Ligand binder design. Structure first.
Ligand SMILES: C=C[C@H]1CN([C@@H](C)c2cn(CCOCCOCC(=O)N[C@H](C(=O)N3C[C@H](O)C[C@H]3C(=O)NCc3ccc(-c4scnc4C)cc3)C(C)(C)C)nn2)C(=O)[C@@H]2CCC[C@H]1N2S(=O)(=O)c1cc(Cl)cc(Cl)c1
Length: 107
């Protein structure tokens, strides 16, 4: 599944709703601890629309469990990410992924 742990609290009340655009900063790490992606390098937040399934399942479900302003650690099992095959050259087969995610705004 996806586990969500608070690093810094959000407002506790404003949770993403289906069809809203979710605006975040993130860093993604493998189980070996290595960073494979981050929006922070780009100085431009990442945006996705909740419900479009245009991010992996653990994001669709995990970021929906965050309140605006929260920074959270998401631990995502392979079946909620890239599964048996992974994404060759980037994500190993059957990989658990760890993200540091900050929910900046909803639009
Ligand atoms: C834009 C990066 C996100 C990649 N994804 C989705 C969109 C994804 C895309 N892909 C296709 C293979 O992309 C490998 C490189 O990913 C980094 C990247 O910048 N991708 C670009 C990308 O996907 N973009 C650029 C824009 O942000 C829009 C987006 C895009 O084309 N989205 C369409 C799309 C494509 C595939 C999927 C998939 S495939 C399996 N599940 C899904 C949901 C869902 C939606 C690129 C393909 C145009 C170059 N596989 N997964 C994530 O769900 C998750 C969660 C949100 C943040 C990123 N990840 S990730 O950090 O786990 C990640 C980073 C990298 Cl360097 C590589 C991977 Cl495989 C995963």
């Amino acid at each position: 599944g996806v586990q969500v742990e608070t690093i810094s609290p959000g407002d506790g009340r404003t949770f993403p709703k289906r069809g809203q655009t979710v605006v975040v900063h993130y860093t993604g790490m493998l189980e070996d601890g290595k960073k494979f992606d981050s929006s922070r390098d780009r100085n431009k937040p990442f945006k996705f629309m909740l419900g479009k399934q245009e991010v992996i399942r653990g994001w669709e479900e995990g970021v929906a469990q965050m309140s605006v302003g929260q920074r959270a650690k998401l631990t995502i099992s392979p079946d909620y990410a890239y599964g048996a095959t992974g994404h060759p050259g980037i994500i190993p087969p059957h990989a658990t992924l760890v993200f540091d995610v900050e929910l900046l705004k909803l639009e």
